[PDB]
Design a protein around this ligand. Structure first.
Ligand SMILES: Cc1noc2c1-c1ccccc1C(c1ccc(Cl)cc1)=NC2
Length: 125
């Protein structure tokens, strides 16, 4: 019937900072992944109504996507890099939970996750 409201992308009462690692997570890691040929399913919240996946938000109770991440980064929502990295890992984990090995979407995630890991292996100070 409906989608849940999307995750918040601003919250005045949350502590936040710009750090060099967070600037890098947007400029390099996110904006690079974003251009990947497999990025599209992850660029916005799962529209379970459009996709006719009525079970999605029965199974996935902490939704996350790169559009939300992008907006959090642009709005300086995070206190540190680790908070953002945690949202990427929630996004990947959700994909692996809802789907099964060998599914096209899981292969897409696996690729993006490898790339993500490659890019965050070394961060700014
Ligand atoms: C993210 C996400 N996690 O689970 C799903 C998605 C998804 C999200 C947006 C559009 C299609 C899908 C799809 C999807 C299914 C097959 C392919 Cl070739 C691409 C996308 N599956 C459900």
């Amino acid at each position: 019937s409906t989608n849940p409201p999307p995750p918040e992308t601003s919250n005045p009462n949350k502590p936040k900072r710009q750090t060099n690692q967070l600037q890098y997570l947007l400029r390099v890691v996110l904006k690079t992944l974003w251009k990947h040929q497999f990025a599209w399913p992850f660029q916005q919240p799962v529209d379970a109504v459009k996709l006719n996946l009525p079970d999605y938000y029965k199974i996935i109770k902490t939704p996350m996507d790169m559009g939300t991440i992008k907006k959090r980064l642009e709005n300086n929502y995070y206190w540190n890099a680790q908070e953002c990295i945690q949202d990427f890992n929630t996004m990947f984990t959700n994909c692996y939970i809802y789907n099964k090995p060998g599914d096209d979407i899981v292969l897409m995630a696996e690729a993006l996750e490898k790339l993500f890991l490659q890019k965050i292996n070394e961060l700014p100070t």
